[PDB]
Design a protein around this ligand. Structure first.
Ligand SMILES: [Ca+2]
Length: 223
């Protein structure tokens, strides 16, 4: 997250870190057994880390649970990142508590102009590299479809939305991928892509979770 703020420990209790020997993506806990993340975060061998604040210090509220199954969306296209969504099943259910909690799936799609909370352990620099240890947060508005398409001509599908600031300075970034965009208390987006981070006229692009709720619900009823 570039241009964000330190969330505060366990104030985003649905945020997970995906670990394959190191943090590599975020995710969102949607019930005690299942995480939503980006399909481009697929790796074999994933351990889900819940209750994290500093990802490099065991502070006492973590739950580390191996994935048993990962399910990339059936129509995921890694070239365009259309349908950039994946489900991860935990080997055992998390213990839900004040620091480890699920986020609701949406009923309706969020609106342009709504301010959402984006979070993660990704790079904090637009130019260059610096990865924080503690979780970072950013409030960013959903942009109109027209603005999004103008920013990325020929690249935005109905399964994507833009959020952020066209002047630059504030955005998600590498290492935030797969993490949550929460608007009106529901999971409306997944950190997916963007041209650089926080550059002028190049807002973040996020997977439109409201289009996936029936797939998520039938998949978790079946696995
Ligand atoms: Ca920790």
């Amino acid at each position: 997250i570039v241009g964000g703020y330190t969330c505060g420990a366990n104030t985003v209790p649905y945020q997970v870190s995906l670990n394959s020997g190191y943090h590599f993506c975020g995710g969102s806990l949607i019930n005690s057994q299942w995480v939503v993340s980006a399909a481009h975060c697929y790796k074999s061998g994933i351990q889900v880390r819940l209750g994290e604040d500093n990802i490099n210090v065991v502070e006492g509220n973590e739950q580390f649970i191996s994935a048993s199954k990962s399910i990339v969306h059936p129509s995921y296209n890694s070239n365009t990142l259309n349908n950039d969504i994946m489900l991860i099943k935990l080997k055992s259910a998390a213990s839900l508590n004040s620091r480890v909690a699920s986020i609701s799936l949406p009923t309706s799609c969020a609106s342009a102009g709504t301010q959402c909370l984006i979070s993660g352990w990704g790079n904090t620099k637009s130019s260059g590299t610096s990865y924080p240890d503690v979780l970072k947060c950013l409030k960013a508005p959903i942009l109109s479809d027209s603005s999004c398409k103008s920013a990325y001509p020929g690249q935005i599908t109905s399964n994507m939305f833009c959020a952020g600031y066209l002047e630059g300075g504030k955005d998600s970034c590498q290492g935030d991928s797969g993490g949550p965009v929460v608007c009106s208390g529901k999971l409306q987006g997944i950190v997916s892509w963007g041209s650089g981070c926080a550059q002028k006229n190049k807002p973040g692009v996020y997977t439109k979770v409201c289009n996936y709720v029936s797939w998520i619900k039938q998949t978790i009823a079946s696995n």
